[PDB]
Design an enzyme around this catalytic site. Sequence first.
Site, PDB file in Angstrom:
ATOM      1  N   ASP A  76       0.801  -1.222   0.000  1.00 36.18           N
ATOM      2  CA  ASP A  76       0.000   0.000   0.000  1.00 36.18           C
ATOM      3  C   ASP A  76       0.850   1.296   0.000  1.00 36.18           C
ATOM      4  O   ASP A  76       1.960   1.295  -0.549  1.00 36.18           O
ATOM      5  CB  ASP A  76      -0.894  -0.095   1.254  1.00 36.18           C
ATOM      6  N   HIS A  81      -3.926   5.875   3.778  1.00 35.34           N
ATOM      7  CA  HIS A  81      -4.609   4.657   3.319  1.00 35.34           C
ATOM      8  C   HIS A  81      -3.953   3.372   3.876  1.00 35.34           C
ATOM      9  O   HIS A  81      -4.623   2.570   4.537  1.00 35.34           O
ATOM     10  CB  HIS A  81      -4.652   4.639   1.787  1.00 35.34           C
ATOM     11  N   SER A 139     -11.245  -1.450  -0.030  1.00 32.73           N
ATOM     12  CA  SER A 139      -9.917  -1.335   0.602  1.00 32.73           C
ATOM     13  C   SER A 139     -10.008  -1.679   2.084  1.00 32.73           C
ATOM     14  O   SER A 139      -9.045  -2.201   2.638  1.00 32.73           O
ATOM     15  CB  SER A 139      -9.399   0.097   0.496  1.00 32.73           C
ATOM     16  N   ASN A 166     -14.688  -0.764  -6.311  1.00 31.86           N
ATOM     17  CA  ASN A 166     -15.753   0.108  -5.827  1.00 31.86           C
ATOM     18  C   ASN A 166     -16.614   0.633  -6.963  1.00 31.86           C
ATOM     19  O   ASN A 166     -17.162   1.727  -6.856  1.00 31.86           O
ATOM     20  CB  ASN A 166     -15.191   1.295  -5.004  1.00 31.86           C
TER      21      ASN A 166
END
Lengths: 57, 274
Positions: free
Chosen positions: B32, B63, B220, B154
């Site tokens: 990430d 994130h 996520s 998404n």
Amino acid sequence: CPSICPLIYAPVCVEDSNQDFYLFVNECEVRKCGCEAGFVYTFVPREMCKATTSLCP
Amino acid sequence: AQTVPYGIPLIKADKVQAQGFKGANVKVAVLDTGIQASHPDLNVVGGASFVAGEAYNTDGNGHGTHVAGTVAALDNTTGVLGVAPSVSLYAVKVLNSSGSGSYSGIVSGIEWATTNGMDVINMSLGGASGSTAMKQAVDNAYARGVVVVAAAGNSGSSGNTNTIGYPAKYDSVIAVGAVDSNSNRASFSSVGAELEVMAPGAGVYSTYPTNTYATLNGTSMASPHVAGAAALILSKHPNLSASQVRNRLSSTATYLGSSFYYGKGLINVEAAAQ
């Protein structure tokens, strides 16, 4: 140009050069579309967009 | 004063932690934006950066720290609790501080995790298309015996259209969709034949820089609950293969409806770790 984005859902409304409104899943996806495709946009309030998301046109 | 996010009891990770299985001796890599290693609720024990100019143990985006917190936030009397708090957590920085990443960056991180004995890989990231090198990297990781987990996407639903992105769409990867606190599918959760399981992805509270917390939405957020669940299973049954852990997660999932929208359903790690 960056090909991968995080999968955070933080939708943002943009206005294209052709005066059409697209709701992207996040700012990273808008930037990707602009870089890779040469797509021209400006952020606008959410109300200008449909409640559903669109992919890079 | 420890906060337990709704996702922890929803997947039944609290039941497994009460059995004494918390992810000890399991190595998990979060691929990430990096991880804020100085956060009090996170113990980052290694990793690598494939983003020029940035070290793996910093997170200029937020994130990666949030995703890591869901997997591994420490069991202390303060802060937040993660799914597998005794895991050995590795930060593999493949995304820059703006959140963006290259295929070569993601491939390099996948390969590093495979070569460095990671038991689980979490990828809360995706693209509309994959690549030959990415497919090879995830196939090698899974063949080596790594449980490979990714956010499904998404992009929501549009009739019968498959909206699963890559790497989630790869056969070697578990594609994870999102549910809310009432176990209902999140509208943004991607759909398709490759959708494998569901986990909490709406209003997920976790660690966030600097030394704070945030509530985020996304597949996520769902992906790390599955990566963490794989680690709890492996701390209980250390001799299982990646395929065996993967089948334990899908076969014991709580049925919620059509596989197109929910895969096998919501993960239940108590049932998966039986």
